[PDB]
């Protein structure tokens, strides 16, 4: 199961908008005109087909279990702010949470070459 942060629990969940913000299709019609359940932003309600969000099935299953924010709403899970540079907020490849590079421990200055996952998704050591 996906672990939730205390501040994510019992935060309000916005009314979901039942069409995709990318293609304007409902859950009945993604871009291939096939049914596909939407993922919806807990802050603004904006939704997306996982295919339109470019999420894998594995990531989709994970983000559906969490209080997810859309691309525009995403705030840093550490400092809780947005900041002014979008190329400074990494999105976790395991849970899609955002973290500013400077809010990582230790801070990052340079982009990872491959996947990046947050400290929440890294398992505890033996």
């Amino acid at each position: 199961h996906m672990l939730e942060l205390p501040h994510e629990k019992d935060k309000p969940v916005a009314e979901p908008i039942p069409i995709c913000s990318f293609c304007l299709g409902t859950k009945e019609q993604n871009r291939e005109k096939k049914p596909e359940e939407l993922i919806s932003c807990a802050d603004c309600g904006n939704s997306g087909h996982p295919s339109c969000l470019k999420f894998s099935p594995e990531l989709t299953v994970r983000v559906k279990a969490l209080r997810w924010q859309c691309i525009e709403c995403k705030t840093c899970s550490s400092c809780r702010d947005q900041g002014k540079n979008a190329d400074n907020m990494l999105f976790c490849d395991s849970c899609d949470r955002g973290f500013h590079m400077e809010c990582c421990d230790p801070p990052l200055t340079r982009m990872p070459k491959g996947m990046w996952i947050c400290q929440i998704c890294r398992p505890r050591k033996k």
Partner: peptide
């Protein structure tokens, strides 16, 4: 890795 910027470009 992905950022808010890259996600915007990828999905926009």
């Amino acid at each position: 890795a992905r950022t808010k910027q890259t996600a915007r470009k990828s999905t926009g």
